[PDB]
Amino acid sequence: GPNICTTRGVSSCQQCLAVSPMCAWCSDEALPPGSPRCDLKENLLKDNCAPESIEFPVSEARVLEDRPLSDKGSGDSSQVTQVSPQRIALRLRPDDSKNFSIQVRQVEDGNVDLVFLFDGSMSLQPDEFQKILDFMKDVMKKLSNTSYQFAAVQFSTSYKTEFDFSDYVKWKDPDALLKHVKHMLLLTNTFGAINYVATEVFREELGARPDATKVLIIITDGEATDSGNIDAAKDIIRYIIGIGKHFQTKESQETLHKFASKPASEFVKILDTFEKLKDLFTELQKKIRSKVELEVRDLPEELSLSFNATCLNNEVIPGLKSCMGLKIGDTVSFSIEAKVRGCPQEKEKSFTIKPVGFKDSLIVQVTFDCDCACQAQAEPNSHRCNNGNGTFECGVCRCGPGWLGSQCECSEEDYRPSQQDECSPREGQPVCSQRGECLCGQCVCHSSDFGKITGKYCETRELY
Numbered sequence: 001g002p003n004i005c006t007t008r009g010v011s012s013c014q015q016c017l018a019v020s021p022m023c024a025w026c027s028d029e030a031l032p033p034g035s036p037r038c039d040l041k042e043n044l045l046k047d048n049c050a051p052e053s054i055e056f057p058v059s060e061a062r063v064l065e066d067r068p069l070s071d072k073g074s075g076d077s078s079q080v081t082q083v084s085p086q087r088i089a090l091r092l093r094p095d096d097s098k099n100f101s102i103q104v105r106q107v108e109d110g111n112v113d114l115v116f117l118f119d120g121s122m123s124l125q126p127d128e129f130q131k132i133l134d135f136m137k138d139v140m141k142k143l144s145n146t147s148y149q150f151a152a153v154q155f156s157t158s159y160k161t162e163f164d165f166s167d168y169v170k171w172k173d174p175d176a177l178l179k180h181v182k183h184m185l186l187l188t189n190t191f192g193a194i195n196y197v198a199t200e201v202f203r204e205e206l207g208a209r210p211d212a213t214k215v216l217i218i219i220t221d222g223e224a225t226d227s228g229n230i231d232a233a234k235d236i237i238r239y240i241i242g243i244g245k246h247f248q249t250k251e252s253q254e255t256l257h258k259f260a261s262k263p264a265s266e267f268v269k270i271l272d273t274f275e276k277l278k279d280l281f282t283e284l285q286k287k288i289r290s291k292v293e294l295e296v297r298d299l300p301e302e303l304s305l306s307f308n309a310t311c312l313n314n315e316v317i318p319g320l321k322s323c324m325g326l327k328i329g330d331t332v333s334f335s336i337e338a339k340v341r342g343c344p345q346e347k348e349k350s351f352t353i354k355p356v357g358f359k360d361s362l363i364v365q366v367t368f369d370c371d372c373a374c375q376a377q378a379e380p381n382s383h384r385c386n387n388g389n390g391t392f393e394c395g396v397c398r399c400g401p402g403w404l405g406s407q408c409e410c411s412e413e414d415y416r417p418s419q420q421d422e423c424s425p426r427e428g429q430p431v432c433s434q435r436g437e438c439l440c441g442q443c444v445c446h447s448s449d450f451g452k453i454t455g456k457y458c459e460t461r462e463l464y
């Protein structure tokens with residue numbers, strides 16, 4: 001029964017491989033030509049393609065490093081393992097896919113680098129401005145003794161770092177860092193302020209931590225007066241907080257979406273008062289370090305990725321990259337299936353899977369199986385191949401220019417042989433008046449020095 005195998009008329013083992021992860025290739029070389037060479041193992045060794053002449057590579061998943069997840073004792077000595085596993089390897093058939101999983105458990109407070117970017121709008125009464133400060137102060141005083149880090153930037157016409165991470169680290173006095181805040185009282189260059197934060201505030205030189213989560217809390221009082229884009233803030237989690245009379249229209253609220261992360265139902269917050277700032281952050285602080293989101297890094301372009309997530313209570317979520325609502329000690333899982341396209345070239349590739357804001361991350365290495373191991377012992381210009389007119393790799397010939405066939409004997413490109421019997425007019429008659437050979441369901445006429453042989457059946461012989 002012809003399968004997806006065979007039916008392709010494949011002409012080498014690699015093609016045979018490239019058709020499908022199942023299909024297998026024979027190379028007995030002593031096998032009669034009429035037998036197909038690309039089927040499946042338990043159906044191409046019945047036919048006597050001598051066992052072990054068959055090449056049947058299999059994609060496989062091996063686990064390389066497998067840290068256990070860290071129990072509550074979190075003495076950060078040689079770190080805590082918050083991801084298991086974090087390095088595996090994968091060998092792949094042509095366009096194949098194989099399952100594997102990953103577990104996440106937060107064994108730490110959670111490191112965040114938080115930048116307040118607060119408005120200095122001339123629309124602000126001194127009291128309204130003071131509440132924003134007290135808000136920031138109140139946020140930070142609740143977050144003493146945490147893994148938190150704070151920087152704050154006032155912005156108006158200008159952008160000024162009022163104190164950065166390193167300053168918060170060595171002082172830890174929200175009142176003495178912000179006692180210096182003088183009110184800018186100019187317009188609202190939100191685009192510039194955001195770019196300024198993304199490049200100048202989030203600097204390792206200024207106490208910023210690399211792996212720590214990048215969160216931005218933008219507190220504005222009106223629509224931005226500048227233009228542009230916030231491309232550089234791409235990787236910063238951006239909360240935007242519009243306040244006051246200028247966000248009554250649902251229209252005016254939409255302009256804050258460009259600045260804030262997505263979804264905007266989560267990251268855009270509108271208030272009408274300034275008294276709601278106290279009760280605001282209390283509600284927002286919970287979902288900050290609640291959820292884990294998977295970061296995919298240095299990923300190959302030819303790698304299909306489908307997903308499958310387990311979260312709170314054995315819940316099956318197919319394709320989820322983030323289980324939310326979590327608390328320290330809680331474990332989750334993710335089922336991943338990785339498909340590839342074609343057989344690419346480097347055959348060794350490293351890419352990283354990380355949860356956002358973590359040092360630990362699943363780095364998976366991947367090689368690709370594609371070429372049959374029988375491509376060595378290739379024997380170019382093989383005698384079994386019309387003698388030097390083709391290369392006999394793996395029990396089979398594939399040919400040089402012009403020549404074609406089993407061995408490269410059908411030099412004349414004359415379509416597929418179809419029924420062999422084409423070489424003779426009727427059942428009993430021998431093939432082509434016995435002065436030719438039937439090649440690819442066609443007759444090449446015998447060459448003698450006495451006469452030249454013509455005609456579809458080599459019948460006609462003109463001589464000299």
Ligand SMILES: *[C@@H]1O[C@H](CO)[C@@H](O)[C@H](O)[C@H]1NC(C)=O
Pocket residue numbers: 144145
């Ligand atoms: C901070 O927490 C540590 C232990 O968690 C405690 O020893 C210390 O007194 C606390 N100090 C403040 C200011 O919260």
Ligand SMILES: *[C@@H]1O[C@H](CO)[C@@H](O)[C@H](O)[C@H]1NC(C)=O
Pocket residue numbers: 306307308318319335336337
């Ligand atoms: C998700 O997982 C199920 C089994 O858990 C599997 O059958 C399915 O193919 C997976 N879906 C995707 C899109 O990876």
Ligand SMILES: [Mg+2]
Pocket residue numbers: 121122123124220221222223246
């Ligand atoms: Mg304003």
